[PDB]
Amino acid sequence: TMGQVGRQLAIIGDDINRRYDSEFQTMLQHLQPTAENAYEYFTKIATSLFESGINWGRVVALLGFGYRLALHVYQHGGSGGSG
Amino acid sequence: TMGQVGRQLAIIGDDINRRYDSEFQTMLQHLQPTAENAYEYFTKIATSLFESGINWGRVVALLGFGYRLALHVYQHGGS
Amino acid sequence: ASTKKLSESLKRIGDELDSNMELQRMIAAVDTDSPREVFFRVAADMFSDGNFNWGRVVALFYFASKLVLKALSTK
Amino acid sequence: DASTKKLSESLKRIGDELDSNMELQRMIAAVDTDSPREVFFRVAADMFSDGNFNWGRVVALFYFASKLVLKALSTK
Numbered sequence: 001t002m003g004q005v006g007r008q009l010a011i012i013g014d015d016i017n018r019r020y021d022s023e024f025q026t027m028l029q030h031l032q033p034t035a036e037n038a039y040e041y042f043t044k045i046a047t048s049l050f051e052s053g054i055n056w057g058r059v060v061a062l063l064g065f066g067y068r069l070a071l072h073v074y075q076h077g078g079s080g081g082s083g
Numbered sequence: 084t085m086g087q088v089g090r091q092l093a094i095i096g097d098d099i100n101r102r103y104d105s106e107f108q109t110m111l112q113h114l115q116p117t118a119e120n121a122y123e124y125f126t127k128i129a130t131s132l133f134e135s136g137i138n139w140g141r142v143v144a145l146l147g148f149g150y151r152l153a154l155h156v157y158q159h160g161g162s
Numbered sequence: 163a164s165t166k167k168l169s170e171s172l173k174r175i176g177d178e179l180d181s182n183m184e185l186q187r188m189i190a191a192v193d194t195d196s197p198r199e200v201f202f203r204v205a206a207d208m209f210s211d212g213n214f215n216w217g218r219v220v221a222l223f224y225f226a227s228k229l230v231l232k233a234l235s236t237k
Numbered sequence: 238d239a240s241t242k243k244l245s246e247s248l249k250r251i252g253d254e255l256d257s258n259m260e261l262q263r264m265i266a267a268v269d270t271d272s273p274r275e276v277f278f279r280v281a282a283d284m285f286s287d288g289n290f291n292w293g294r295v296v297a298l299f300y301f302a303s304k305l306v307l308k309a310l311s312t313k
């Protein structure tokens with residue numbers, strides 16, 4: 001049927017999701033309440049990751065978490081207060 | 084009347100290219116000859132920028148420069 | 163070898179992308195469900211005149227990165 | 238807005254799988270018959286055509302798509 005490549009990529013994604021379940025679950029545990037808190041935290045993880053050395057895949061994974069942070073703020077953004 | 088947004092976005096891009104000509108030129112001045120030379124320098128510029136604080140636009144510009152390095156390797160040096 | 167000049171250059175480009183009201187208005191006008199088809203169109207329409215520069219690329223990076231955000235807001 | 242050790246390790250393992258995944262690399266190399274724009278257009282919808290979503294599919298799509306941008310740029 002149509003979309004064999006997309007399905008293959010969907011299968012590969014499901015496998016990655018399956019094998020690294022804990023790694024993705026860890027991404028849901030550092031959500032930030034505001035854009036400023038997300039930019040701060042995104043910077044801290046990015047800085048740590050680059051200090052450990054990076055490859056193309058690591059930059060892609062970093063941006064994956066970044067969109068997880070952005071999506072949380074974009075749908076459920078707070079307004080400071082907790083400090 | 085077909086392709087207005089795309090052409091509108093192209094106009095903004097051209098204006099950005101003109102106003103920040105010197106800035107884009109600085110990107111070409113720091114091109115790298117190999118993949119790992121690109122990953123090292125990309126690391127140093129990213130960490131330097133991150134030390135100054137970032138917003139969405141600043142990350143996009145960093146990834147813009149990242150693709151500038153990447154494209155140069157994916158075409159020339161390091162064949 | 164040296165990054166401070168490049169760093170400030172990236173700050174200036176990025177801040178224009180982040181504060182350009184016209185760009186933000188275009189991103190907000192492509193709500194209404196379908197970021198996938200809008201990117202498909204803009205990506206080609208942007209280079210229909212045969213010109214290329216990295217001002218267009220980063221503008222497309224910014225525009226596209228915001229459509230990914232919207233797309234994720236449905237699923 | 239602080240603890241990062243565990244997340245960093247998680248991103249290293251996910252990122253390293255993507256960077257060394259031979260199948261993903263083979264797929265990226267199999268669509269070198271031009272229009273990376275149209276392939277992305279197709280795979281982006283086809284990979285979520287079953288109504289499922291997870292961030293393994295997202296990062297797989299990010300990786301595959303980020304390589305098509307490189308190829309797209311290699312045409313000028």
Ligand SMILES: [C][C][C][C][C][C][C][C][C][C][C][C][C][C][C]C(=O)O[C][C]([O])[C]OP([O])(=O)O[C][C]N([C])([C])[C]
Nearest residue numbers: 035038042066067069070073074139142143146223227
């Ligand atoms: C490849 C090429 C392209 C590239 C792309 C990538 C980039 C990076 C990303 C990640 C980043 C992450 C961090 C941040 C998060 C948050 O918060 O987020 C939210 C939103 O929403 C944003 O916020 P803000 O900024 O604050 O906002 C803006 C404006 N408005 C309108 C939204 C308010």
Ligand SMILES: [C][C][C][C][C][C][C][C][C][C][C][C][C][C][C]C(=O)O[C][C]([O])[C]OP([O])(=O)O[C][C]N([C])([C])[C]
Nearest residue numbers: 056059060063118121122149152153156157299300303
């Ligand atoms: C939105 C999300 C999506 C995802 C993300 C996007 C962005 C990315 C980051 C930047 C990237 C960084 C820059 C540098 C690198 C380079 O160099 O490059 C070149 C070649 O071409 C490449 O290199 P490599 O890859 O490493 O090599 C090839 C591969 N193999 C297979 C050969 C190993």
Ligand SMILES: [C][C][C][C][C][C][C][C][C][C][C][C][C][C][C]C(=O)O[C][C]([O])[C]OP([O])(=O)O[C][C]N([C])([C])[C]
Nearest residue numbers: 209212213214222223226298299302306309310312313
């Ligand atoms: C999921 C996630 C994922 C999503 C996101 C991503 C984004 C990306 C964007 C970027 C893209 C860019 C590339 C393109 C280039 C061009 O131009 O292409 C056409 C040709 O063909 C062109 O051609 P012409 O125009 O004809 O010619 C050229 C000119 N010169 C001057 C350069 C020679």
Ligand SMILES: [Cl-]
Nearest residue numbers: 070074228231
């Ligand atoms: Cl946003």
Ligand code: NA
Nearest residue numbers: 026028029030
């Ligand atoms: Na916990």
Ligand code: NA
Nearest residue numbers: 240241242243
């Ligand atoms: Na700790």
Ligand SMILES: [Zn+2]
Nearest residue numbers: 071072075076
């Ligand atoms: Zn949320």
